[PDB]
């Protein structure tokens, strides 16, 4: 299905569009600040998921 980026709200450029390992949210690596130059190989959690951690 069509996930969208939390920052820019577009679902284009699938190749750069990170999925959150904890929910159905997404972010383009090029929209991320700080600079994310590549798709990380480990788990990645969006900011909404960080809010639920302890």
């Amino acid at each position: 299905n069509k996930v969208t980026c939390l920052v820019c709200r577009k679902g284009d450029n699938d190749e750069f569009l990170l999925l959150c390992d904890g929910c159905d949210r997404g972010c383009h690596i090029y929209c991320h600040r700080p600079k994310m130059e590549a798709v990380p190989e480990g788990d990645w959690f969006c900011t909404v998921c960080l809010a639920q951690q302890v």
Binding site: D14, E15, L18, L19, D21, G26, V39, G42, D43
Partner: peptide
């Protein structure tokens, strides 16, 4: 981490 492309 997986992308929208690697998941679809």
């Amino acid at each position: 981490a997986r992308t929208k492309q690697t998941a679809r």
